[PDB]
Amino acid sequence: IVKVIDGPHSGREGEIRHLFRSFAFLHCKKLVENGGMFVCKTRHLVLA
Amino acid sequence: KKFLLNKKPHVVTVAGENRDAQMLIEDVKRIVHELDQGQQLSSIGVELVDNE
Amino acid sequence: MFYHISLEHEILLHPRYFGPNLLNTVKQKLFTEVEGTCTGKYGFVIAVTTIDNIGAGVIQPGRGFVLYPVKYKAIVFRPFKGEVVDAVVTQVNKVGLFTEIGPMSCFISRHSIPSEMEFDPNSNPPCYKTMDEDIVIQQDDEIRLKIVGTRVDKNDIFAIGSLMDDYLGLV
Amino acid sequence: EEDASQLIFPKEFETAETLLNSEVHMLLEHRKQQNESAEDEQELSEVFMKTLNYTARFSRFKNRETIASVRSLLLQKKLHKFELACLANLCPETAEESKALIPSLEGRFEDEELQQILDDIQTKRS
Amino acid sequence: RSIFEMYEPSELESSHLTDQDNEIRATDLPERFQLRSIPVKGAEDDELEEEADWIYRNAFATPTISLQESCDYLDSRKGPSTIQKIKEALGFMRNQHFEVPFIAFYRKEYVEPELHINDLWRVWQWDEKWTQLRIRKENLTRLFEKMQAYQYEQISADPLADGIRALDTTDMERLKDVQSMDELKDVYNHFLLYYGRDIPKMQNAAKADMYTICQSAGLDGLAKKFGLTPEQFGENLRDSYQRHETEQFPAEPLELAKDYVCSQFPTPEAVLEGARYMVALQIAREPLVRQVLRQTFQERAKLNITPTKKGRKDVDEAHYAYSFKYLKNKPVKELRDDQFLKICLAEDEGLLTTDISIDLKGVEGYGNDQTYFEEIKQFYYRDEFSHQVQEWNRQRTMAIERALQQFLYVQMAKELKNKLLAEAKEYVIKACSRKLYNWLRVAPYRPDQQVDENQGKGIRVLG
Amino acid sequence: LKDLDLDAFAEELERQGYGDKHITLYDIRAELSCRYKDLRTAYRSPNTEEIFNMLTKETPETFYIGKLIICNVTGIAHRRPQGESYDQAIRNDETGLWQCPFCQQDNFPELSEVWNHFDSGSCPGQAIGVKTRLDNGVTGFIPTKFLSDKVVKRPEERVKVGMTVHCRIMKIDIEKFSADLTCRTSDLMDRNNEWKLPKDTYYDFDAEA
Amino acid sequence: PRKGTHLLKILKQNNTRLESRTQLVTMCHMGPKVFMNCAGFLKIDTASLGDS
């Protein structure tokens, strides 16, 4: 579980499922957009 | 080489997946040159085509 | 329609949260849990208004997790069939008219809409004109609608309407 | 089967408490006013914002005193709970209008008995 | 039992067997004309001339607001003769029922050198657009005559209230002169402003909002006594010349109110607020006012962009929106290609927030700025130093400021946004089309011809 | 058919009552000459840029100069000695022993040992740069001078084969599928905004600041 | 596509090749406008035709 206070999804919460050199696919159940799943850069994250 | 000399197509094409297409085209061209040395064929020609 | 009922929910608390702020953490957890969610029984919950009481935590055997059954008075939004509610038109498209039923967004179709309401796509803002004009249903306008059908798409409510009336909508 | 037009709801919802547009608006407003204070708190969410900007555009009377008066003069009748919020939020013009609105009123009360209520509601409005 | 009762509708429509498919196969005319949304009816010379003029005006003549470079690999502005060429092309497409390819190949002598095949496709699309526009204008006219008759009936029922405004060639001519769905919806809103509650009673008798608050409380009279009418104000706004002297009532507005106090407006201040809202909405929903202001937006529309925390943190060095996450007054004239489409995508993603304003923003050297609001103030002001005139001028200033920054600066801004977005989408579609064109124009391979049956049967290839 | 007058025939047609047909008649004549001639452009071999964008999936917008990339170390380039330039050996005093200037190994007992090392072919040479591979197969060369803000002698002093390093593109060569890169922290930070892409003419540097 | 499939199906049922464009009007019963539209774009390779 990692928080995203800023970035492509500010004030967002979700569990990580897949990583990349500079990307991360976060999965959640509260969201509705894209079946409840988004993407954001790795360095733009924080260890909650 | 056996398959080519038996069938004798007019042109060979290679899928452009990655840079290995360079080595494949180089190999096909070397085979064609070796076959044209003794005049087994008459220049078939090799090309690179997008595989999308 | 929005209502105010008392619901109950059991939440487990990890032994690390023990301390003087135990009750505070339970209330905080309940807020973070039952707020903006949706269940097929009570519908979509907006927020929680208050908590009646905090049940006596029962420590589980072989598990530090102690569960509290808390009862909270909260508001819920569960639209039923036949009800009429207000909303603001969000977009007009040739496929239909879009609105916003609070936490829900409906959609109307030309077949339901009278035969007068033709289309205007060439203009920058599309709009359904009752043939001879006389009433605009463009964006940012208060329009009523009768919920003739409901639906919950996995914690997501989306009802449907119709239109061919004049006295609960825009006059 | 669930159809508010014919007055029928599940057992758990039958014992519910009706809410008005202005009522939910002031409730969410008070909640926002209480939440913005006390730093180090999880701010509101999109649901609260949309609900706020949705209920603020339908506040027929911001005065809690007027809300109390209207609910009190409405509850004195014999109509069910469902008939209190819909009508209180709609505020139609005339009795024929209100009857065409809610099909349950068709033959439930008198034309003038409802016209007077509609006029009282429109006057209490701000 | 029929095959339709057995087979699945999916397979049936994939095999094409419905009554609609039978009609398409049996009926004449090209299949693509029958499948078009709007039918393809005939056309006389009178209609064809006006249609050709309108097509040449709106498709090939009128440039794009954004800097969309004309890119046509198939091939530079056209001339008047294109009008006659489009006339001939449209005649062939409608009267004789000839499709674009046939007209481009076997009738090139009547379309070239002004129209090519892509131009013919464009003319065909604008033909469908014009057909829709004409149909809806004729509809409007018919039922507008009906509504005029209905108002005449309501009047013959029995001093009419000022809210029951009379109309005639003043609005019929505007309708019949409408040249685009823009003006169509402008006349729509104009008619709703005055008669927003007639379709109900009209349709009921035929089959047998806040402005409404103002209408019911009697605020229509105060709105009329306010001063200039919306039509006079619009003419003034257009001509930049006070051709209509501002009228004035023998009384201050606050004192003229009172009489209109009625519960919801318990005080003369509330009555004045309601009347101001009413006059502002009138000035906003007026055909001429809206047209002049739309033109002023297309001519003068400064763009600004503000990134929230979302965009501030996301839009890094490698993000696509890195070249426009901060903008401060950028003329829409200089939007190049799909730059605006990318901005809208970034906005929908919550990264940026756009703001299209007719005036500048954040200019330190405000000297000789002069905003559009200040310019139009002269068109409604009175040049007198009496206290009554000052009060009326302050009331009118408030009405104009509201009409603008609560209706027009939002509606026209959204309209310009949609037009720029549509132009960007058109650019993307043209890019995709010219790419598919480069892909398909390639001819079959051929061996070293410099050195019969193989070519007759096709060359053999090894992939 | 080339000697026939088609303008007279077109005039005859116009006088008869068929309208203008100059282009129609010329098209019919061109058709009699090689019935149905494939107007499509002849086949052409993909050029250098087409081959690059094809078998690398890169384009001028996705792959350009100054972009940040994440490459992996793979090999090292060296500059081998000459043929008779063996007298350049220096008696390194920090170790009190002879040293070759090509390999910088200061552990040879005598100049004879230095010459034996030269003859044995064990001298890899003076390092020139580092070789890396990109996710799209392009090769990357990072000269020793562009390996970091601080001066570096050989690649032995930084990174090694099998390490991921962030670099910045300096120059590209399509015919060879190579890129001269640089990973200096100064360049990665871009102190003076020298490598970043140009911003809009109406950018609000004031709001950014 | 709908008319193309119909024409191909008629040709298959007849079990005869499109010897001439006049067939589209005689046996296929194609409309005059449809014929005027699709006549100059259907090649009938008389070289490979051979016999009729």
Short mmCIF file of N, CA and C in Angstrom, two decimals, chain C residues 120 123 125-127 136 138-139, chain E residues 180-190 290 415:
data_model
loop_
_atom_site.label_atom_id
_atom_site.label_comp_id
_atom_site.label_asym_id
_atom_site.label_seq_id
_atom_site.Cartn_x
_atom_site.Cartn_y
_atom_site.Cartn_z
N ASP C 120 -29.10 19.37 -32.56
CA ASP C 120 -28.33 20.52 -33.04
C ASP C 120 -26.84 20.24 -32.82
N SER C 123 -23.73 23.18 -33.93
CA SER C 123 -23.34 24.27 -33.06
C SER C 123 -22.30 23.76 -32.07
N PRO C 125 -22.33 24.07 -28.70
CA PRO C 125 -22.98 23.36 -27.60
C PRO C 125 -24.23 22.65 -28.06
N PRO C 126 -24.19 21.32 -28.23
CA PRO C 126 -25.41 20.60 -28.62
C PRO C 126 -26.55 20.83 -27.63
N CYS C 127 -27.78 20.78 -28.14
CA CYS C 127 -28.95 21.05 -27.30
C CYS C 127 -30.21 20.50 -27.97
N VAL C 136 -35.18 25.46 -22.95
CA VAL C 136 -33.81 24.99 -23.15
C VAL C 136 -33.44 24.01 -22.05
N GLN C 138 -30.17 22.82 -21.78
CA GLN C 138 -28.73 22.81 -22.00
C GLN C 138 -28.00 22.48 -20.70
N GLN C 139 -26.68 22.60 -20.71
CA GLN C 139 -25.88 22.32 -19.53
C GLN C 139 -26.06 23.41 -18.47
N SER E 180 -26.40 28.87 -39.69
CA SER E 180 -25.61 27.84 -39.03
C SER E 180 -26.31 27.42 -37.75
N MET E 181 -25.98 26.22 -37.26
CA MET E 181 -26.57 25.79 -36.00
C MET E 181 -26.22 26.73 -34.85
N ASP E 182 -25.14 27.50 -34.96
CA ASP E 182 -24.87 28.51 -33.95
C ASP E 182 -26.04 29.48 -33.85
N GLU E 183 -26.35 30.16 -34.95
CA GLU E 183 -27.50 31.06 -34.94
C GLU E 183 -28.80 30.31 -34.69
N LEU E 184 -28.89 29.04 -35.09
CA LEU E 184 -30.10 28.28 -34.78
C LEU E 184 -30.33 28.18 -33.28
N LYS E 185 -29.31 27.79 -32.52
CA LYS E 185 -29.49 27.73 -31.08
C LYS E 185 -29.60 29.11 -30.45
N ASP E 186 -28.99 30.13 -31.06
CA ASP E 186 -29.22 31.48 -30.58
C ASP E 186 -30.70 31.86 -30.69
N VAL E 187 -31.33 31.60 -31.84
CA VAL E 187 -32.76 31.87 -31.94
C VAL E 187 -33.55 30.97 -31.01
N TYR E 188 -33.10 29.73 -30.81
CA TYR E 188 -33.71 28.86 -29.80
C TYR E 188 -33.75 29.53 -28.43
N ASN E 189 -32.59 29.94 -27.93
CA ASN E 189 -32.52 30.59 -26.62
C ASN E 189 -33.30 31.89 -26.61
N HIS E 190 -33.28 32.64 -27.71
CA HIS E 190 -34.05 33.88 -27.75
C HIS E 190 -35.51 33.57 -27.50
N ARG E 290 -25.46 37.77 -28.83
CA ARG E 290 -24.66 36.56 -28.83
C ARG E 290 -23.78 36.49 -30.07
N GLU E 415 -18.08 27.39 -26.23
CA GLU E 415 -18.28 27.23 -27.67
C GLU E 415 -16.95 27.28 -28.40
#
